[PDB]
């Protein structure tokens, strides 16, 4: 998909249809924010000398 469409936040669901499945169908959802860094840990250390 176009980057302007994925950054929009649309959710794409991968329906997989198979015989062995208990319900014969499974879904997985991927979103703009499915993989995100849950913890940003920055520590700025600003000095004046070496």
């Amino acid at each position: 998909v176009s980057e302007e469409e994925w950054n929009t936040g649309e959710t794409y669901t991968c329906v997989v249809a198979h015989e062995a499945l208990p319900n014969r169908v499974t879904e997985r959802t991927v979103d703009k924010s499915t993989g995100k860094p849950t913890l940003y840990n920055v520590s700025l250390v600003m000095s004046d000398t070496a």
């Binding site: 176009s2 302007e4 469409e5 950054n7 929009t8 936040g9 649309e10 959710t11």
Partner: protein, 973 residues
Amino acid sequence: DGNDVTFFNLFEQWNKEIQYQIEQYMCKCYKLWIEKINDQWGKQKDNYNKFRVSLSNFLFFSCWEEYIQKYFNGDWSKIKNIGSDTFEFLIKKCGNNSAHGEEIFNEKLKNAEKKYIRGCQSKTYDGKIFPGKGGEKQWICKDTIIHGDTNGACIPPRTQNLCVGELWDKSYGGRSNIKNDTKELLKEKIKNAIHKETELLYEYHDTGTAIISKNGLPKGFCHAVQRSFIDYKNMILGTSVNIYEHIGKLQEDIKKIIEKNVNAWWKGIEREMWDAVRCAITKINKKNIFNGDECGVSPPTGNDEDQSVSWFKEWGEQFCIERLRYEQNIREACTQGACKRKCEKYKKYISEKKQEWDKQKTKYENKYVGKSASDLLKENYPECISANFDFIFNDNIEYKTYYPYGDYSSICSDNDMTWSKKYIEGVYVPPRRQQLCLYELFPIIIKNEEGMEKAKEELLETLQIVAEREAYYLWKQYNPDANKKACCAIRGSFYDLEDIIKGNDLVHDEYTKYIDSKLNEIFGIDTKRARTDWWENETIRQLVWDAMQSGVRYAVEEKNENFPLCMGVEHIGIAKPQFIRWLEEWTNEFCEKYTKYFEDMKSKCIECKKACANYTNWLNPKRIEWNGMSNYYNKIYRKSNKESEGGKDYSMIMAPTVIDYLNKRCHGEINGNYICCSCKNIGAYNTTSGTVNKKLQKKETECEEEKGPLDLMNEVLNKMDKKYSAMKVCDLIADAIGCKDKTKLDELDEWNDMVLIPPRRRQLCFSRIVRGPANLRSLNEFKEEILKGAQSEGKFLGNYYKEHKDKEKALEAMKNSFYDYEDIIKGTDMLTNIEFKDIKIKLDRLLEKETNNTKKAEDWWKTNKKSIWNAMLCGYKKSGNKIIDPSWCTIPTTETPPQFLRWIKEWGTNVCIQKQEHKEYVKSCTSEIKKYQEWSRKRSIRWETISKKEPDANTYLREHCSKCPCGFNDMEE
């Protein structure tokens, strides 16, 4: 026609004359006069029926022509420039649509024939009540794109702080409290709100905290309560000049409640609502006994009923009072340190208020054609007399350097102007007198008072300064016998300067009005004698004339030209009466213009039609002005100072009639020292010349008839958003979020099937909200603001077409996007979950359907009801900054042709670039040239597509399209 051309000219002049007369006349003899015109009108209509543009067409065209002539200068038919507000005044004065002239004339004569606790806290809009210090609310000189679009009105601090009362609760944002309220309940809520507003305004002004307030009622309290009542009236009516946060939702809800006609409701309950204010004022007696009628028994109405006018009057009063307080502070401090600090405070004040004054003047002057802002402000409120708004708010760059502080800087120690009677009977002010500079005098006349000697000295010095400036500028203006014409022009300006100093000036504009008012007390019928005494002995006459001569010396030295004989004369003649001097100036201007235009006729008569329009346009008002001059002359032909109605002496004319006095004054040639006028027609033919009867029998009224069809061009758009402006709406709407630099690579064979989709996939730069899964909250505010949010549909000339192609094509690509945009809203052919078969089309249907199926997306809001949008021109202008031609400005907005459902428009765009540029490359290796035949096979499938009117696609390019015939019909290797 034969013998009817004279009738047509007579009818035109007669129509203009009666129209002017009734406008001026707006008692026993009046009934005799009004029936005379009634009989004359019937006779003219009978003759016009024999003549036949239609009689109703001609009156409307005459109204619009007069407007475009006097209030708009140069009689240019630039209907494009006129804004939305002025159209209202024109359709009111000239009639809705066209061919309503008979009704407009009919109605004009008919008018002539008939001649407790609510949750509101104490007001803090102009400052918190003592012991409170801050909290001042500034004027909101901003407009809402969704509601009201372009509106120059500035919301007063008081209106922002209007006691909405129980109609509106601010808890967690803004939520209307009348979502489900009965009509009777709404009336009670508004009554309580008005009562509380009156009470809080009284306690705010009684403590003397309102800037206005700094009978026995608090100063300005009645003004404030009346204006709050007007604001309430416009809140219920829904006609608010500018919608504040609380204004919009309340207006919509009140419209819903009543219509489940609002004007009739308020016109019924206004008496009760004003009784609410009266009852509040009576209840004020508990504090101390006011009967309640102090602020007016009847509700405010009339010219003040207009909310823009009311807000502007409040601005004027508040600004004048603040200016007076700054005057007091500067005077006390100065008469370094505190004095300076106050001066910069005043400078900051004026700098802050300049934008507000400009916006409000622009709105008021345009909406009320003719009337001026300063006149309203000065006549309605006495406190504004001592302020010249034009001088204080001059836009000249050098002005700020000359007077950093403004009108209290002293305290901190050109040819197209029409002869106008404004600020004056029938006498008219020469353009030179209107140009007579008083700019440098005003700071001094402000600064100096109550002191005889200092007044004399400083007034004389600044009078010399203004005399030198006027000499310089007029000499440069008139001179590129020509000098001899300017000789008396210099003499006339000084000759006019005497009356302002004397106090006999006929013109009474703001400048001379204030000058005379202050001279009445500086040198003070004996007061007039006192001014003349300064004008007689030290002389001051010869001194200021020497200043005049020095000014012309400076001007001519700048021009490096010899000094003239006229100004080498030191002794001048006695001053003639002001009207006589103005009458001579008018006659001389008539000589010049008549000779020039008549020789232009003999030469030219191709733009002969423009010359005819120009000559007729110049001559027509001159007839009425000559009638006025003759009337005044016949009123003061033989009258002394006492006999004349005015307090001026006219005993030295000594001629039987005005045309006879024209003789022996213009008989010879211009002399400068004594003679200023010279016409070719010295004889008593001016009366016949003014009327278009005699001429040399040349028939030019046919062109005037050919000018009549311009009424067809006088079409009224009847919409609240204008695509002409100068730009106003362009600032409000923001860049689209999350759509990148579009048209990054387009018409470079990126075309692909999903019908051959052009680069409409990307050049459409919808905002994230519409294109994303999220629905929209309200169509009136988000789809509203998001479709315009695609101002980012302006990167064609912004980034890509800025220099890649000619300017026209960049705008042509926008035409493609607009129609594309239109078909996204209803049935395009993209087949994509974001553009077709998509939910964004459902985003529209969902929201309108939520509004009780008020209108289908394909019924209205189909890019038809609000087709205009910005037309993307703001984005075009945002980055490209290229002016759009008037013919180019109609395609980015709506046009009836839809270009057939994108099946043959996107096809239209293919050859416009994707084929013709490869063509010109071929005309500019041969394998690469032969590598341009793959578009020939791709022509086959699209030919099948169109095969599903004209026979095939080729003819469409040949005749529907303009740039297409350049392209080769078929490559075929």
